[PDB]
Amino acid sequence: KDKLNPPTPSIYLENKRDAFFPPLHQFCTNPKNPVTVIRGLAGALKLDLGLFSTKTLVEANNEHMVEVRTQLLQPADENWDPTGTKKIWRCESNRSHTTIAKYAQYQASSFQESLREENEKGPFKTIKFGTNIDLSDNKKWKLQLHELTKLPAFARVVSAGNLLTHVGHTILGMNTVQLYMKVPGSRTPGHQENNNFCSVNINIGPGDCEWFVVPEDYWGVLNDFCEKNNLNFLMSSWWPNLEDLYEANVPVYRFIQRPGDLVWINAGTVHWVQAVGWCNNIAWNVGPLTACQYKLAVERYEWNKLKSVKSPVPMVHLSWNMARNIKVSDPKLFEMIKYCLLKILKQYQTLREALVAAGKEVIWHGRTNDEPAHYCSICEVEVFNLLFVTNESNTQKTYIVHCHDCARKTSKSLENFVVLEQYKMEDLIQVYDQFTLALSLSS
Ligand SMILES: OCCCNc1cc(N2CCc3ccccc3CC2)nc(-c2ccccn2)n1
Ligand SMILES: [Fe+2]
Ligand SMILES: [Zn+2]
């Protein structure tokens, strides 16, 4: 169909007025738009993209760590097996480390070498992609992070309307910025964002990137291709065959992101990306306060448990922080959060009563304010409020956390464990009771 290659939802910005215009964030967060490309964003805001140029990064922090992914230079939009006889989904990539200075040399010499070649089915060249460069330290990247505060509020790393701001602690690469340094053919394999949170990506240039996007409600189709072809959807590297997708009637959005264009990946959108030239990119996540974002984040949280995959966003901890500190005026969002909190509260009361009925002591432990969420040291599930810690770890004050299930499996009557309580039931009951719909006259 004509419907399988739809146009890209695109906003064309000329000036600051266009950037701060409220219908912009409404357009981005609209679930009908799986991706929005905000063209001319850097130029409209007079953002200095030079602060993220390779030359400036080397000057700034030359020994800064870079995760290198070594990949094959594949033709156009295809992915061929090593031999060059068939198109396959699987893509191979080894990981190593280098520094900004060393990767910069490679990026620069790669460009010089292509100029020289320009003046002179397999097999494929090997290229290196500089990935996951951690721009979290404000003392190392002061000017860079300050430049990003010039964005409109809805797209910033930190803002009142961002769920990831309400988490109350750092989640690396989600509420901190990551940088990517690229050469032609540097590929980002197919994926969804952590816990289906929206992402913001700005191309620093000077080259272009080519994006491929499938709406969230088709992710189950791609999951099936992965299972059929012996791939883990969440954990393997794969590059979809567009003819497979065409055949299965999956619509594919496809577009070029030029320097200074911002790409908004909406909640749960499946996407993959390749550099067309030499460029850098910066990216982070944002969680808009919408029913759709919250719903998709909870669904993925629950799906991750089934797949034994850690959720980077602690949705229980987050949901309590929303109830404590956010006046929520959307009826559909409010009812989702309320329902979730009730589930948490009931499950916690059931467990706590079973412990007390078995004669197991619950130790008041409290909590430092701003203390991060805890995860089970064995299975990596989020553990809320009741923490299971071995007698020895308790004595040593290391407080290594287990979930109830993992503690039970280790020690059948919990004889090896103490149960630590970080919040009184009465306090949580009140936060729940005092969490009510705020009236708003807007839509
Ligand atoms: O525009 C730049 C950013 C493109 N987006 C990327 C790149 C990337 N890199 C690491 C993954 C990887 C593995 C193997 C080969 C290549 C890559 C891509 C880099 N990882 C992610 C990511 C990871 C976890 C959750 C959400 N997103 N997003
Ligand atoms: Fe990503
Ligand atoms: Zn566990």
One domain, residues 320 and 434? yes
Q: What is the CA radius of gyration of the chain?
A: 24
Four-point Cα dihedral 322, 327, 328, 329, nearest 10: 180
Domain count, the chain: 3
Residues 78 and 205 in one domain: yes
CA dist 153 to 55, 150, 165, Å? 29, 8, 12
Per DSSP, 11 falls in state E
Cα separation, 328 vs 193, in Å, equals 25
Instruction: Give the domain extent around 432.
Output: 291-357+425-443
Of 288, 272, 87, 111, nearest to 183 by C-alpha is: 111
Q: Which amino acid is at 311?
A: S
Task: State the distance from the centre of ligand 3 to the C-alpha of 162, rounded, in angstroms.
Answer: 29
In angstroms, what is the resolution?
2.0
Return the residue whose CA atom lies nearest to atom 6 of ligand 1: 188
Residue 62, φ and ψ in degrees, nearest 5: -70, -25
**Same domain flag for 364 and 434:** no
Residue 165 Cα to ligand 3 midpoint, Å, equals 27
Of 266, 290, 314, the residue that ends a domain is 290
Residues 274 and 377 in one domain: no
Mark whether 257 and 119 lie in a shared domain: yes
User: How far does residue 375's CA lie from ligand 3's centre (Å)?
Assistant: 8
CA–centroid distance for 181 within its chain: 18
The crossing angle, in degrees rounded to 10, of helices 291-306 and 331-357 is 40
Q: Are 55 and 136 found together in one domain? A: yes
Tell me the CATH number at 283: 2.60.120.650
CA–CA distance, 194 with 284 (Å, rounded to integer): 11
Alpha carbon distance 16, 151 (integer Å): 10
Report the alpha-carbon distance of residue 329 to residue 254 in Å, rounded: 36
Q: Are residues 243 and 331 in the same domain?
A: no
95 CA distance to ligand 1 middle (Å): 12
Residue nearest to atom 18 of ligand 1 (CA): 188
Residues with CB under 6 A from ligand 1: 69, 93, 129, 131-132, 180, 188-189, 191, 193-194, 201, 237, 273, 281, 283
Report the DSSP beta bridge partners of residue 275.
209
For residues 256 and 8, give the distance between their C-alpha atoms in angstroms, rounded to a whole number.
Answer: 10
Last residue of a domain, which of 251, 267, 290?
A: 290
**One domain, residues 258 and 154:** yes
Say if residue 341 is in the same domain as residue 363. Answer: no
Closest Cα to atom 26, ligand 1: which residue? 193
Count of residues making up the chain: 443
Rounded to whole angstroms, the Cα distance separating 275 from 182 reads 7
Q: Please say which residue of 290, 310, 345 terminates a domain.
A: 290
Q: Evaluate the CA torsion angle 405, 406, 412, 418 in order and state its sign.
A: negative
Q: Are residues 49 and 160 in the same domain?
A: yes
Which numbered atom of ligand 1 lies nearest the CA of 192? Answer: 26
Q: Are strands 209-214 and 362-364 parallel, antiparallel or unpaired?
A: unpaired
Q: Are residues 265 and 143 in the same domain?
A: yes
Name the residue of 131, 208, 239, 256 whose CB sits within 8 Å of the most ligand 1 atoms, as the mutation to test its pocket: 131
Do the beta carbons of residue 209 and residue 258 sit within 8 Å? no
Cβ pair 40, 27 in contact under 8 A: no
| Pairwise CA distance, residues 351 & 72, whole Å | 51
Take atom 17 of ligand 1 and give the residue whose Cα is closest.
188
Residue 206 preceded by cis peptide, ω within 30: yes
User: How far is 293 from 163, CA to CA, in rounded Å?
Assistant: 9
Tokens representing 375 are 């995860």
Which element (helix H / strand E) includes 219?
helix 219-228
Q: Any alpha helices (H) in 229-330, and if so which ranges?
A: 242-247, 291-306, 315-325
Question: Nearest 5 degrees, angle CA 290-CA 293-CA 296?
Answer: 145
Q: Percentage helix, strand, coil, to 5, in the chain? A: 35, 25, 40
Residue owning the nearest CA to atom 11 of ligand 1: 188
- Give the count of beta carbons closer than 10 Å to the beta carbon of residue 107: 20
Are 266 and 363 contained in the same domain? no
CB count in 10 Å sphere of residue 27:
17
**The domain that contains 392 carries what CATH number?**
2.10.110.20
CATH of the domain at 442: 1.20.58.1370
**Residue 353 phi, psi (nearest 5):** -65, -35
Say if residues 183 and 230 touch (Cβ distance below 8 Å): no
| Both tokens assigned to 221 | 């189709």
Q: How many Å apart are CA 246 and CA 83, to the nearest integer?
A: 25
215 preceded by cis ω (within 30°)? no
Nearest to 294 by CA among 336, 259, 325: 336
Q: In this structure, are residues 319 and 348 in contact, taking their beta carbons and an 8 Å threshold?
A: no
E-assigned strand segments in 196-265: 198-206, 209-214, 253-257, 262-265
Question: Which DSSP state fits 184?
Answer: T
